[PDB]
């Protein structure tokens, strides 16, 4: 027979650098009653950027 015994040892090191760019856009429509009949329209837009 042939018998073996191997043993190892690793050491690693990783570095990541990310960069994201997001845009948003929405519309919100509201109708209701508060001492009379109401209505709204909201239009928003946003921009995010993270590193």
């Amino acid at each position: 027979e042939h018998a073996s015994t191997d043993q190892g040892k690793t050491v690693s090191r990783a570095t990541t650098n990310s960069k994201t760019e997001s845009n948003t856009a929405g519309v919100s429509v509201n109708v209701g009653y508060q001492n009379g009949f109401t209505a709204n329209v909201t239009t928003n837009y946003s921009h995010t950027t993270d590193n």
Partner: protein, 51 residues
Amino acid sequence: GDTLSTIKAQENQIGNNLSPGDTYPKKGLSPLALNTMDQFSSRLIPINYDQ
């Protein structure tokens, strides 16, 4: 048999004149909107499924 809702004329639905045998609005004119859905009005009268 049930009262759906009780209405009372707003300050803009008051008839200035009503002679005997006449109407308001007069004959030939178009009738009044009961609610008008305005900043003065009350909520619309609801009904169930049974009603």
